[PDB]
């Protein structure tokens, strides 16, 4: 079985102010276990955008149902886009660890810009 990859097929997404951005991501394996999260930015100062495991993210909807057993689609839609949303978004796989979940693989990132 090949190692899990996180595929972000789009380098750049361009969205009219007020519309919805769709940010695509696929994970190629269900192993190792752990949630997918999305961030804007890649620093230690990156901003959390979506966490599969928990949290309230009112403007984010997931394209697929992440509770389905075979799900590999981690694409999200972010609603009511404004210029403050512009930046680079990364879809990131975590594995389980102690004391907590650890980052396992990041996607290559998708630029969101606003027209």
């Amino acid at each position: 079985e090949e190692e899990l990859q996180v595929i972000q097929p789009d380098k750049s997404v361009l969205v009219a102010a007020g519309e919805t951005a769709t940010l695509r991501c696929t994970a190629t394996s269900l192993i190792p276990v752990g949630p997918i999260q999305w961030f804007r930015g890649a620093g230690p100062g990156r901003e959390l955008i979506y966490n599969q495991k928990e949290g309230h993210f009112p403007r984010v909807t997931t394209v697929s149902d992440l509770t389905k057993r075979n799900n590999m689609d981690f694409s999200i839609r972010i609603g009511a886009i404004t210029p403050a949303d512009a930046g680079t978004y990364y879809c990131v796989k975590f594995r389980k660890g102690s004391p907590d979940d650890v980052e396992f693989k990041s996607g290559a990132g998708t630029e969101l810009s606003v027209r």
Partner: T-cell receptor
Amino acid sequence: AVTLDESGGGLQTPGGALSLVCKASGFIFSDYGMNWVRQAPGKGLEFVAQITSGSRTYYGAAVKGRATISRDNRQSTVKLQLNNLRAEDTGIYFCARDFGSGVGSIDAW
Amino acid sequence: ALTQPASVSANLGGTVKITCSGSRGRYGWYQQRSPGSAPVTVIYRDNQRPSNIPSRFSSSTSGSTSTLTITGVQADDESVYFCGSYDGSIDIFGAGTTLTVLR
């Protein structure tokens, strides 16, 4: 009409450097990724470099460390600098525009 | 890496398929009539046909594979067809499939 006009090619010195330039017109230049793709004699298309609308840069394995791609949105140009040229760099180089998903999203050459 | 066959053939007026696999990204299909000449995009961003391209060209993408179909092959469809895709790590072209028109 979309145009992508290339210049800076021709004969080059082994070990030397070149600057290819592509001058675009007929579209909103800053919204597209721009690519350089080449083809050596008797071979297929080979990816060289790309710069996204957000100015992230990507290089093919065969030019890594020798290539620099840049864009100038105000002039609608993209430039490819390639140094320490060798025979394996001989070929036809095409400028190409992409819709944001890299080389699977090229619509004009 | 992207894998596509070296050659395919069809009759004039027939239907032909070319499959490329290896990426879960978006696929483009680029027609080149002779080596060194500008490619012509027949499909890009998976399944989109540029407006000047005849409707006989279509494609599907699913999983890690894409298939170009030409329905009603014409003599001017003879060419090499290159698949291209950014696979979420690198931008790659396949090695090209040559379409021969049988007669």
